[PDB]
Design an enzyme around this catalytic site. Structure first.
Site, PDB file in Angstrom:
ATOM      1  N   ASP A   1      82.136  74.692   6.214  1.00 28.39           N
ATOM      2  CA  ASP A   1      83.411  73.629   6.622  1.00 28.39           C
ATOM      3  C   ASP A   1      84.045  73.530   5.232  1.00 28.39           C
ATOM      4  O   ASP A   1      83.354  73.092   3.997  1.00 28.39           O
ATOM      5  CB  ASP A   1      82.729  72.498   6.966  1.00 28.39           C
ATOM      6  CG  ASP A   1      83.905  71.480   7.778  1.00 28.39           C
ATOM      7  OD1 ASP A   1      85.136  71.999   8.017  1.00 28.39           O
ATOM      8  OD2 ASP A   1      83.535  70.312   7.872  1.00 28.39           O
TER       9      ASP A   1
ATOM     10  N   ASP B   1      87.110  71.473   3.678  1.00 31.22           N
ATOM     11  CA  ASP B   1      87.780  70.265   4.120  1.00 31.22           C
ATOM     12  C   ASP B   1      89.128  70.216   3.236  1.00 31.22           C
ATOM     13  O   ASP B   1      88.960  70.260   1.949  1.00 31.22           O
ATOM     14  CB  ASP B   1      86.752  69.075   4.021  1.00 31.22           C
ATOM     15  CG  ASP B   1      87.251  67.955   4.698  1.00 31.22           C
ATOM     16  OD1 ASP B   1      88.194  67.999   5.663  1.00 31.22           O
ATOM     17  OD2 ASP B   1      87.094  66.959   4.210  1.00 31.22           O
TER      18      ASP B   1
ATOM     19  N   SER C   1      90.406  73.954  11.689  1.00 31.20           N
ATOM     20  CA  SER C   1      89.854  72.742  12.030  1.00 31.20           C
ATOM     21  C   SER C   1      90.568  71.532  12.702  1.00 31.20           C
ATOM     22  O   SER C   1      91.873  71.691  12.810  1.00 31.20           O
ATOM     23  CB  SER C   1      89.146  71.945  10.968  1.00 31.20           C
ATOM     24  OG  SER C   1      90.105  71.109  10.008  1.00 31.20           O
TER      25      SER C   1
ATOM     26  N   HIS D   1      86.927  76.251   9.258  1.00 34.87           N
ATOM     27  CA  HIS D   1      85.531  76.713   9.625  1.00 34.87           C
ATOM     28  C   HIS D   1      85.326  78.017   9.541  1.00 34.87           C
ATOM     29  O   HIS D   1      86.162  78.772  10.092  1.00 34.87           O
ATOM     30  CB  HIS D   1      85.321  76.184  11.139  1.00 34.87           C
ATOM     31  CG  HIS D   1      85.571  74.817  11.587  1.00 34.87           C
ATOM     32  ND1 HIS D   1      85.630  73.663  10.626  1.00 34.87           N
ATOM     33  CD2 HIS D   1      85.567  74.190  13.033  1.00 34.87           C
ATOM     34  CE1 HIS D   1      85.817  72.613  11.528  1.00 34.87           C
ATOM     35  NE2 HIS D   1      85.842  72.796  12.812  1.00 34.87           N
TER      36      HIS D   1
ATOM     37  N   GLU E   1      81.246  71.966   2.955  1.00 36.63           N
ATOM     38  CA  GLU E   1      79.988  71.916   3.362  1.00 36.63           C
ATOM     39  C   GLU E   1      79.433  72.806   4.191  1.00 36.63           C
ATOM     40  O   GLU E   1      79.984  73.542   4.664  1.00 36.63           O
ATOM     41  CB  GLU E   1      80.207  70.474   4.542  1.00 36.63           C
ATOM     42  CG  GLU E   1      80.635  69.471   3.622  1.00 36.63           C
ATOM     43  CD  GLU E   1      80.709  68.146   4.885  1.00 36.63           C
ATOM     44  OE1 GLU E   1      79.870  67.919   5.667  1.00 36.63           O
ATOM     45  OE2 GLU E   1      81.733  67.638   4.815  1.00 36.63           O
TER      46      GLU E   1
END
EC number: 2.7.7.-
Length: 281
Positions: free
Chosen positions: A79, A81, A109, A116, A140
């Site tokens: 992930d 962000d 996302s 992603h 992440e």
């Protein structure tokens, strides 16, 4: 455009690990697509196949599909962000380099400003799951224990899940080598956890009131007091500013350790010894 035509989605459609999700406050809660109850990320019978999830999305008016990662499936979820600008272009150099090095299924996302990546592989042992960067972006990585939202909004034509070695994630993620979260949770349950400062609060006086509480709940363990303070709404750069041969934070915590008489002892659970009333809400 058609989400069922995407190769990665056809690959994920082999697994009965789908959920649906709905936006709640600032979180996205996964739901069991067959009965509309909240779904556990570790109970396989709380999930569905993709047909069930799509029917459930319609039946209950959910916001989208999600897919639960487990240790037994081949998938790793990466992930990225807050890496896209308003034209959905990558605006973080670390992210642009990751995408050059790890070419596999990539989607935009739900927020529209992250990415992603789904890869078939295994995470290296020496990286943290979550790495935050100075510009507010984050990386992440997970291979089990939670779900990922699935948008089908393919980025740069990367529509297929690939088998790749993920050693290269060590270039991007941070390395790694009672309990603090347990003391934080305790203080929150006791009403001893501070709110963020408001207009016209005297922040330094808020710091000292909180340091006094930490001295009690942490048992005058100044290292633990400091770790917890840094995760609180009262943390700011002044904490680490040199002051008279210490820092403002260390002087504050040492004064609180001297000022407070009692200490919490987890063996004794002497919560009524706490000298300070709960914060008002």
């Amino acid at each position: 455009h058609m989400i069922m035509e995407i190769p990665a989605i056809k690959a994920l459609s082999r697994y009965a690990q789908w959920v649906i999700w709905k936006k709640e406050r600032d979180t996205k809660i996964p739901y069991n697509p067959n009965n509309g109850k909240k779904a556990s990320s570790t109970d396989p019978l709380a999930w569905g196949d993709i047909d069930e999830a799509q029917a459930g999305l319609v039946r209950y008016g959910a916001n989208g599909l999600g897919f639960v990662l487990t240790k037994s499936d081949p998938f790793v979820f990466i992930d990225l962000d807050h890496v896209l600008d308003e034209n959905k272009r990558v605006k973080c150099e670390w992210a642009r380099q990751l995408l050059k090095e790890i070419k596999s299924y990539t989607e935009i996302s739900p927020s529209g400003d992250g990415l992603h990546v789904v890869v078939s592989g295994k995470l290296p042992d020496y990286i943290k799951h979550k790495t935050k960067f100075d510009d507010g972006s984050a990386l992440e990585v997970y291979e089990s224990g939670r779900y990922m939202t699935i948008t089908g909004e393919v980025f740069d034509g990367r529509d297929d899940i690939k088998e790749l070695d993920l050693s290269i994630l060590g270039e991007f993620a941070e390395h790694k080598i009672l309990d603090d979260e347990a003391i934080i949770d305790l203080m929150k349950r006791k009403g001893q956890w501070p709110d963020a400062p408001k207009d016209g609060d005297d922040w330094s006086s808020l710091d000292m009131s909180f340091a006094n509480r930490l001295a009690f709940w942490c048992g005058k363990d100044i290292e633990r007091m400091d770790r917890i303070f840094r995760q609180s709404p009262l943390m700011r750069q002044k904490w680490d500013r040199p002051t008279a041969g210490s820092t403002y934070g260390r002087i504050t915590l040492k004064k609180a350790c001297d000022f407070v008489d009692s200490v919490y002892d987890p063996a004794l659970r002497n919560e009524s010894d706490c000298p300070f009333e709960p914060y008002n809400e």
